[PDB]
Amino acid sequence: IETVPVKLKPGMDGPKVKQWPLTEEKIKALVEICTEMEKEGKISKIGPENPYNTPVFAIKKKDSTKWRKLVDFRELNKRTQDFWEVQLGIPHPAGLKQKKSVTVLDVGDAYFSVPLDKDFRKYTAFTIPSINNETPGIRYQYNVLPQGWKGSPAIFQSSMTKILEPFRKQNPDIVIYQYMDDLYVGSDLEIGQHRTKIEELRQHLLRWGGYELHPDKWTVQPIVLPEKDSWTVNDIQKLVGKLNWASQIYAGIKVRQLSKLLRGTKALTEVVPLTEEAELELAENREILKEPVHGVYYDPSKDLIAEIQKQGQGQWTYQIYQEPFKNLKTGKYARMKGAHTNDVKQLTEAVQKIATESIVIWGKTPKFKLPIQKETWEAWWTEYWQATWIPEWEFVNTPPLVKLWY
Amino acid sequence: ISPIETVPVKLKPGMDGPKVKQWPLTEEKIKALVEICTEMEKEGKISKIGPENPYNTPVFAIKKKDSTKWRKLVDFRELNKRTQDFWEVQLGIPHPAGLKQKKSVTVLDVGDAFYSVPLDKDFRKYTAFTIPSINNETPGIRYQYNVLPMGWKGSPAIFQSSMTKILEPFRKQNPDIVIYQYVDDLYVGSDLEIGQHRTKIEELRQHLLRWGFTTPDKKHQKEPPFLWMGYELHPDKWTVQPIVLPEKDSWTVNDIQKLVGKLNWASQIYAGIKVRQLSKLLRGTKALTEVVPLTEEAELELAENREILKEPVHGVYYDPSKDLIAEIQKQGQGQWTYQIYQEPFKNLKTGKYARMKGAHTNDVKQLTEAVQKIATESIVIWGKTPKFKLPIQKETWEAWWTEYWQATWIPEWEFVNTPPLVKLWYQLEKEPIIGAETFYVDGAANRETKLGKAGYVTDRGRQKVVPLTDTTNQKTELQAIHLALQDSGLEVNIVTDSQYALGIIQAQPDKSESELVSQIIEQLIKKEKVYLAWVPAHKGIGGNEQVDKLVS
DNA sequence: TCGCCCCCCTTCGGTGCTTTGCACCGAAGGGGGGC
Ligand SMILES: Nc1nc2c(ncn2[C@H]2C[C@H](O)[C@@H](COP(=O)(O)OP(=O)(O)OP(=O)(O)O)O2)c(=O)[nH]1
């Protein structure tokens, strides 16, 4: 079988990212997974003369209790040639976000059937760590299309189409979208009936060689202004500051009348009656924030960015944009676990869901601005990750001047 | 020399080998060098070369801990820069607290370890060197390495990798025997009886010998205490090898640097070590030979450490059937010490956390950082996180992660009452305070001017402006809040337009590298109720507009 | 007059911000320890 030649981007070198510490159970799972991939020729043992490395870890879903090996190829993907230029990329179907139910299937194992350009394999190196450093790290590199590498769906594109064409013409209104190692398959059938034909697609791919989503019920959360019958100076300050911030987003929002209402040097608790020409501004700007912003369209040539804010009692607001103040989506995430007390687990789950929605809607994940200390996130996040992909992120400390999303 | 296959290595693209020249050496290092080289050549470790090879790298010799023997070193700094990058496979240092108790223990070390691993044939010409006769009466002999040389960037990783390959057949065949492998030092523990254990050792040594790795008797430890990785391993406990702290009448910067490093090394088993006051002496200095007089605090800190170090201590070994427990105590000035144990009063190890992260922070954040450092160390050593015992009330932590806007968390922990407890030193009110004065604060500086003003106006008619010199925009805004807290009563409402100042204060810091922010913190702690509100500037908001009119 | 690894403490310089200094962060200097 013949391989496809692949390059890094001009002036880029391969990844050189250090392996981080792993629990006993993850090291064990990685050793058992990698020794069998070794036997099946998917990976090969290497030594230190390969100067590249990418961190490896493992996840174990509650969906399926077997351990899944996860190599964080984010750095390699950033340095790999784009496949829109190579002319072997994957188009996103706009009908996916319409469907009643979308099931995610992990199909990464199909990549192991196609070999990787022998000159590119050295960039896929990873190192298994050692409990109490009893042993030096153990290094492998891929011989086949690796899971988590953005070139694997691109190279496997021609095959997967032939594998799917029978199913999709026997089912012309089910839509299938391949993203990284995943298939997002959406239909408009009853939630049990839909699952029956997911079972049929799995057993169809099984002869050659999940998560239940409902995009119809993903609600956008707008900027709501509070409604009281009596208003203090501080209430009006808070309101004027909120609307002033929203004047960078929405069109024609006014505050001069309320600004005048706070004239003088007043006590923050002094209740101020609302002017006839002040009450109008509120309900007038209430309805500018009613329904969406005009003139904001998705551009597939630019990155998606997601901001998240902790709002307390399990609530998390988020905005997805490409240019500042031009939000393509605003939302509120809320989850039930029954632990009641884990901020990092909630944020990790909020990231996966937001990133999942962006895959369904636009076909790619956004870069997250995470409201968390870098070291707190890195101490715990892998314990809650359940996706076969990993989005890009950065860490911001986020002093909330305005109470704008909640 | 091992028959193992060599690791291929390359020079970085576009580069050549080193052409550096030899320097004089004492004609007692030379005799040792010639004794090593003439014997290395007879074993095939080096080969004579000639003028067709135009490379060279200087040589020297230092003595080994076994006092009688010498160590041959090549100053390959030039070759290393031109040599390809490697991925280092040594990821960390094994710790004795991670060992389980074993019935039978053996410690082995390989003789001439690096010299038993062959070097890439095409790379050998670049290792050219020349051993010197005193006074240059005769020209020196040129050689090249056929094996891994001491001083080359690639030698450690290539040896470690090769040692791992050689050991793997023995490990797979014997999963009941633990082999800690650090470079060429092999710790071998098992639960076999002494007779069967020694048979396994004899078999391991013979396997190493077939692959070219000798195990000399001088380095074959068979009885406790075992000297290993800087420790002493007893059957039931382990100790660190003796730590001798320097004692000086006059201290230089460099002396203090060594002192702090020794104390850090000691802190892994000696509880309560502190180094903040001694390390403060290192700040702002500009020469390692500069004499630094110890401050009174540093003398006290040093004397406390000396008291702790005079006591005998030991760690115990890891019992996988019992929980790991980590207990933390606060020591003051952002210093924290911890102990990790499974049964009470039997420490596996200790440690300390004292890093100052960020310009402004509080004890709750730093405790969280200590927990994260301990959690990472636990994964490294034992492969799991411990249960924590923390000197912080549950109500305190709960008030923190509800009030603080960033996500934060701590794993399973139990409150332990060991004062001083970690607490929040103030909390901003979530609503304005009725009957409290309302201060509208503002500060402004001139960007090119370096002069500014801070001040306030008040719903009770009070007002104040102070002119500031050599200040910034952000400083004047902090200064304006400083004045409001200074002139107000126990309860105060403060309105600012500086998102910067609000961001700092709303995170409830209790310590700061800025003396201005520390003054603010001290005033916040003495208050009874504080509500801090923000409004946008230059939008003529009632109150803020007047104080901004007045800072002009 | 060397190499590689982990740790801590301090300094410095690059990055991004609807900034003009500030906070953050990674690298590099010093030290400890290991072979
Ligand atoms: N470049 C360099 N490498 C060292 C140094 N100390 C130890 N090593 C490396 C090279 C050694 O061959 C290897 C094992 O260390 P040893 O102290 O056991 O020396 P070696 O085995 O070579 O001789 P010996 O054990 O005395 O028979 O670790 C050093 O100071 N500089």
Ligand SMILES: [Mg+2]
């Ligand atoms: Mg040795």
